[PDB]
């Protein structure tokens, strides 16, 4: 469904049938609520505990097809542009793509073959570095986030006497906002995520109805406006 | 089997990264268990204390084929001068220092007293210290033209007690095997003083038994407190 259909069925589901009908929502408000509902839905469906099914990214066909249009593959750029201080002397710093929402798969291609990057926790890092070896298992590499400015910088730890040729990252692209109409105005240009032009929902049509329902629920919680509704509907932001 | 094949087979036998509960080891851990299994297995095989084989160092063709590649021969003529022995006619010879167990040991004698038998190869007999005093005078088990008594002493030495002058000392022993190192270990780490890759020098027949023993040792190491 295109943006006009988002807005028309938003109006239908919000106030065109309600008995003591409420004021219609302005297009900026509808775009804001739709973008919020989109992000909430993405976060709810990525995490199993966030939805009533207990199903995350790839726990069912529907969850695969939900994020299928939001998956992207890119590469981390070696961060030798400027000097820096790494926590580990034997780690190579890489910069992830700017439009990164969530990392789901990483791999590094070295001279000793491809290796799956395992994101190790800080307590896990301490445990592993208290051991005599201090290097990954055969077909794996280690990873920790380092000092990041304006984009995520990442330290890749591989086994000794190994060089990294490329660093691929299969991630979830940051969703683009849903903007119903050109938000340009003479009184001031308002933006949802830095863009005023019309922006279609760049995800699969399977969850457009879900985004619409969530947006309507958020609109009605805003209309109710007491602390109660804000608190319970803020639980699903996550 | 090569080092890559030790590692891949070791993972396959441990069911690493399979769906069921399992165990995953680093290449240093794999090397540790492979080398420990190697050394345990060959010591047990030499002494014949392995129940599965139940045979000693060269008691059958199987054990010969297993430990053939550790058998090293040594020859020396230099004698260590200043040392205190249990007889006037005692000479000390250094041991190669990579020796594990001495299996053949013989001594060539150069003396004018044994006329026309000069250069006689003489059997070096390891003698305990109980037996030494009553074996100095023994004409059937003591030192002679055809027999030399060897006693182990400090600093990797062999005290050879002989009636005649000892010229050369020949040995054939079991050597320190090269450790099984699957990866170039980082700085500081090493197995038996070796940091680089080290392949097993034994025959491929026993490599799979070494792999099985290493897997069992790994399961023991991870599951000795649970």
Euclidean distance between CA atoms A173 and A39, whole angstroms: 12
> For residues B151 and B133, is the Cβ–Cβ distance under 8 A?
no
Resolution number, Å:
3.2
Q: Which helix (H) or strand (E) holds A220?
A: helix A208-224
Q: Which residue has the tokens 């804001």?
A: A32
- The answer to whether the Cβ–Cβ distance between B26 and A133 falls below 8 Å is yes
Q: A163-190: b or e for each residue (b if 16 or more CB lie within 10 Å)?
A: ebeebbbebbbbbbbbbbbebeeeeeee
Nearest to B189 among A132, A137, A159 (CB): A132
Experimental method: cryo-EM
At A135 the three-state DSSP class reads coil
Q: Compute chain B's Rg from CA coordinates.
A: 23
> For residues B153 and B92, is the Cβ–Cβ distance under 8 A?
yes
**Beta sheet of A91-95, edge-to-edge order:** A71-75, A164-173, A100-110, A113-119, A140-145, A153-157, A91-95, A77-78
Partners of B183 on chain A (C-beta within 8 Å) are 159
At A104 the three-state DSSP class reads strand
Of A110, A137, A160, which to mutate for an interface test with B (greatest number of B Cβ within 10 Å)? A137
At B104 the three-state DSSP class reads strand
Partners of B185 on chain A (C-beta within 8 Å) are 160
Report the candidate in B105, B87, B85, B86 with the shortest Cα–Cα distance to residue B95. B105
Euclidean distance between CA atoms B221 and B209, whole angstroms: 18
- The answer to whether the Cβ–Cβ distance between A138 and B29 falls below 8 Å is no
> For residues A158 and A106, is the Cβ–Cβ distance under 8 A?
no
Euclidean distance between CA atoms B126 and B148, whole angstroms: 8
Euclidean distance between CA atoms B162 and B93, whole angstroms: 13
Of B9, B32, B186, which to mutate for an interface test with A (greatest number of A Cβ within 10 Å)? B186
Euclidean distance between CA atoms B152 and B158, whole angstroms: 5
Partners of A136 on chain B (C-beta within 8 Å) are 26
């Amino acid at each position: 469904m295109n943006v006009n259909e988002f807005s028309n069925e938003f109006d239908v589901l919000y106030n065109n049938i309600m008995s003591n009908a409420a004021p219609g929502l302005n297009e900026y408000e509808k775009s804001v609520l739709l973008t919020k509902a989109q992000e909430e839905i993405v976060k709810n469906y990525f995490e199993p505990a966030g939805n009533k099914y207990g199903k995350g990214l790839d726990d069912s066909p529907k969850r695969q097809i939900d994020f299928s249009e939001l998956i992207k593959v890119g590469e981390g750029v070696l961060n030798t542009s400027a000097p820096t201080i790494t926590f580990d002397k034997r780690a190579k710093v890489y910069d992830l793509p700017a439009d990164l929402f969530l990392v789901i798969n990483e791999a590094v291609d070295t001279n000793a073959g491809t290796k799956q990057i395992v994101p190790i926790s800080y307590s896990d890092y301490t445990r592993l570095m208290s051991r005599p070896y201090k290097e990954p298992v055969k077909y794996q590499a280690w990873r920790i986030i380092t000092t990041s400015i304006n984009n995520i910088s990442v330290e890749l730890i591989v086994n000794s006497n190994e060089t990294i040729t490329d660093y691929k990252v299969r991630y979830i692209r940051r969703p683009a906002p849903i903007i119903t109409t050109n938000l340009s105005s003479e009184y001031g240009d308002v933006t949802i995520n830095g863009v005023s032009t019309v922006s279609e929902c760049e995800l699969n049509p399977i969850i457009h109805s879900e985004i619409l329902q969530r947006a309507v629920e958020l609109a009605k919680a805003a209309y109710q406006g007491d602390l109660q509704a804000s608190v319970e509907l803020g639980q699903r932001s996550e | 089997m090569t080092n890559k094949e030790f590692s891949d087979g070791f993972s396959t036998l441990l069911n690493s990264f399979g769906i069921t509960p399992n165990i995953t080891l680093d290449e240093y851990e794999k090397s540790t268990f492979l080398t420990n299994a190697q050394e345990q297995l060959i010591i047990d095989i030499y002494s014949g204390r392995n129940i599965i084989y139940g045979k000693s160092f060269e008691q059958t063709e199987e054990i010969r084929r297993y430990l053939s590649n550790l058998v090293e021969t040594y020859e020396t003529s230099t004698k260590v001068t200043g040392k205190l022995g249990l007889s006037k006619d005692s000479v000390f010879f250094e041991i190669p220092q990579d020796t594990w167990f001495i299996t053949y040991e013989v001594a060539f004698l150069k003396d004018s007293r044994l006329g026309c038998l000069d250069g006689i190869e003489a059997s070096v007999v390891p003698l305990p210290q109980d037996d030494l005093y009553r074996a100095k005078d023994n004409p059937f088990r003591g030192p002679s033209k055809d027999r030399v008594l060897r006693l182990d002493i400090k600093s990797d030495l062999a005290e050879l007690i002989s009636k005649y002058n000892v010229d050369k000392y020949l040995m054939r022993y079991i050597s320190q095997p090269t450790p099984i190192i699957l990866v170039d270990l980082p700085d500081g780490l090493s197995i038996n003083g070796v940091s680089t890759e080290s392949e097993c020098e034994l025959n491929p027949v026993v490599h799979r038994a070494i792999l099985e023993r290493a897997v069992q040792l790994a399961i023991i190491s991870k599951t000795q407190l649970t």
